[PDB]
């Protein structure tokens, strides 16, 4: 608001900004012997008493202007004070009205109060972290320097319009300032468009603006610098302030202050139910068959392909564990972003050189110079499809990562920096699982999501040893106990059905693994609102080794590659009956009536020997969600 009191001794000059209610205090300087007052104003202004009225402090007077001023002091308001003694006293007030409007994409539409509220009925604009490189001759993220090097970069910013409508000689006695609070001055940068030079950044908290009189519009471009984290909730305030500088001896006086609130776009992942767009892989040695199978699967699925040759590969074939692809979106642009794990094996150059580029951001967190564990591999990093739990909706799913049940002396955990970053990204509130028992410790080794036409749309697949044991019991009691597992593989010993069925240590180990799987299944059923109809069991066998950790007895068939309605499942080399393996037949009969095609790829000698599967060695980029994140209420 604006409070201007009138004094009969001398006339008063004041500025009334259009869009702001201005109340007149009419008792501060009122004549002592006075009893009543009257108001007469010019037609250009509207006066509301909320003929003669008493001067009691309760009553109030509001003034509203309709059009911008063409000249200084072009409206006049007169107040006649009526007293029982002496003639009435006249007081004068001169009004000049300006129009100062700082506007952004507050409606989240794409065209250009003062608070950011989630939900479809909310208001507040969105910034995008300029984490890409639109310059083809640069070797730095374009938000590191203080210049705009190419007009295409302008598309990754946010627009802000300053509309000014003032008289011609207005700004000879007034000044405009743009600023951001000192705690957020190091997480934002603002350029002025005329081609563009910096205005606000990590070294200039505030800048004075040069604006001419009359009508004018100014264009500002805003770019964020840091993703939201524990120390930075994500709200950035930009403030426009009008200062009076009439007298040179005196300092400036603030007379009007408007502001806008921006939210930094969070990092949003993509689950397995989204259509693919691009597939990454690796080539190291004896990989012609594996790469050929991946290529034909990609061709069938109608997507791209990117392959790293061995020169830059450095004998590292686990693309999944190093990088994870998500997206960041805003009403005017949606661009993917690669997340680089603190793990720095031979593939530390691929995500930093061959991935990030034009319209491909890059962000990473944690300590890079060692001090991590296997749980930091992106194996413990999955997302469930949109879910509804006990009346609360998550249209963007929930992050899932595994760690130890309780802290101890030999327990491991995901790095705290990564955990806090994921938690700070609210839109997918993370959920913890118990996956420390695995030797590598990857939640990708026991859970998987598949798109389904019916019911909720998805179907979680979990590894369960009982399923394999019942299949083997059937194979034995129909009389084919002579079947040899690992027949195709020559180097590894073939095992007959009776021996594996009568083994006792293996049964005990699989009972322990089943108990862990049951606990995780109950956790997921509680946290994702699942019934028993949305969970499918795929047979598998686990065996314990040094320090009692579980490893896949035969290739893990839960860690499969899903591309729309096509599946690349690791070949188990299970026992064959009537010229078809029982494991493959069972899994095909379990997944096909859902509307899928199953293709088994062999990676025993190239991946399984080094404790890996297909999905652990390939990565997929997926189309961003159609649902706008800002429309969800956390």
């Amino acid at each position: 608001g604006t409070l201007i009191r009138v004094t009969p001794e001398q006339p008063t000059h004041a500025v009334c900004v259009l869009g702001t209610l201005t109340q007149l205090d009419i008792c501060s300087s009122a004549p002592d012997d006075c009893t009543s007052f009257s108001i007469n104003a010019s037609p250009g202004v509207v006066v509301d008493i909320a003929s003669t009225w008493p001067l009691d402090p309760g009553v109030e007077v509001t003034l509203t202007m309709k059009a911008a001023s063409g000249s200084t002091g072009d409206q006049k308001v007169q107040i006649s004070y009526y007293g029982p003694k002496t003639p009435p006293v006249k007081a004068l007030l001169y009004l000049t009205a300006v129009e100062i409007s700082l506007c952004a994409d507050i409606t989240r539409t794409g065209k250009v109060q003062r608070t950011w509220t989630w939900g479809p009925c909310g208001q507040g604009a969105i910034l995008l972290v300029n984490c890409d490189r639109d310059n083809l001759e640069s070797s730095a993220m374009d938000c590191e320097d203080d210049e705009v090097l190419d007009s295409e970069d302008l598309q990754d910013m946010s627009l802000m319009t300053l509309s000014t409508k003032t008289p011609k000689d207005f700004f000879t006695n007034h000044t405009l300032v743009l600023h951001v609070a000192r705690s957020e001055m190091d997480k934002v940068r603002v350029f002025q468009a005329t081609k563009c030079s910096v205005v606000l950044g990590p070294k200039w908290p505030s800048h004075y603006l040069m604006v001419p009189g009359g009508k004018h519009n100014m264009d500002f471009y805003v770019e964020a610098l840091a993703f939201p984290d524990t120390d930075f909730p994500g709200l950035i305030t930009l403030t426009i302030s009008l200062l009076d500088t009439s007298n040179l001896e005196l300092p400036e006086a603030v007379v009007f202050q408007d502001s806008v609130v921006f939210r930094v776009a969070p990092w949003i992942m993509t689950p397995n139910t989204q259509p693919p767009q691009e597939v990454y892989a690796c080539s190291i040695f004896e990989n012609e068959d594996f790469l050929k199978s991946v290529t034909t699967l990609a061709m069938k699925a109608k997507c791209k392909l990117t392959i790293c040759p061995e020169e830059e590969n450095m004998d590292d074939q686990w693309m999944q564990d190093e990088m994870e692809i998500g997206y960041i979106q805003a009403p005017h642009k949606t661009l993917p972003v690669v997340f680089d794990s603190p793990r720095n094996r031979g593939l530390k150059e691929f995500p930093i050189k061959r991935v990030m580029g034009p319209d491909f951001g890059y962000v990473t967190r944690g300590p890079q110079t060692g001090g991590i564990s296997g749980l930091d591999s992106f194996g413990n990093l999955e997302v469930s499809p949109p879910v509804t739990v006990r009346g609360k909706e998550y249209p963007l799913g929930r992050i899932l990562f595994g760690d130890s049940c309780y802290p101890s002396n030999d327990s491991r955990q995901m790095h705290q920096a990564l955990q806090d970053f994921l938690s700070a990204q609210q839109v997918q509130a993370p959920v913890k699982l118990y996956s420390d028992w695995l030797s590598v410790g990857h939640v990708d080794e026991f859970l998987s999501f598949v798109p389904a036409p019916d019911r909720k749309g998805f179907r979680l697949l979990l590894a369960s040893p009982r399923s394999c044991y019942k299949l083997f019991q059937e194979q034995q009691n129909e009389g084919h106990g002579e079947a040899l597992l690992f027949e195709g593989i020559k180097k590894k010993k073939q095992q007959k059905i009776k021996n594996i069925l009568s083994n006792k240590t293996l049964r005990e180990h699989n009972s322990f693994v089943e108990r862990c799987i049951d606990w995780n299944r109950e956790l997921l059923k509680r946290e994702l609102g699942l019934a028993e109809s949305d969970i499918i069991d795929i047979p598998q066998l686990f065996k314990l080794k040094e320090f009692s950790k579980a490893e896949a007895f035969f290739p893990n068939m839960v860690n499969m590659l899903v591309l729309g309605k096509h599946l690349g499942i690791p070949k188990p080399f299970g026992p064959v009956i009537n010229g078809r393996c029982c494991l493959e037949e069972k899994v095909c009969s379990l997944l096909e009536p859902l509307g899928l095609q199953c293709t088994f790829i062999n990676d025993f000698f190239t991946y399984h020997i080094r404790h890996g599967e297909v999905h652990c060695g390939t990565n997929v980029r997926r189309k961003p969600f159609s649902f706008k994140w800002w429309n969800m209420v956390p």
Binding site: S139, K187, A226, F227, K348, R365, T369
Partner: peptide, 12 residues
Amino acid sequence: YESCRYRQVLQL
């Protein structure tokens, strides 16, 4: 911030 992470990774 994120630029500093970029430079540190490229150095390694």
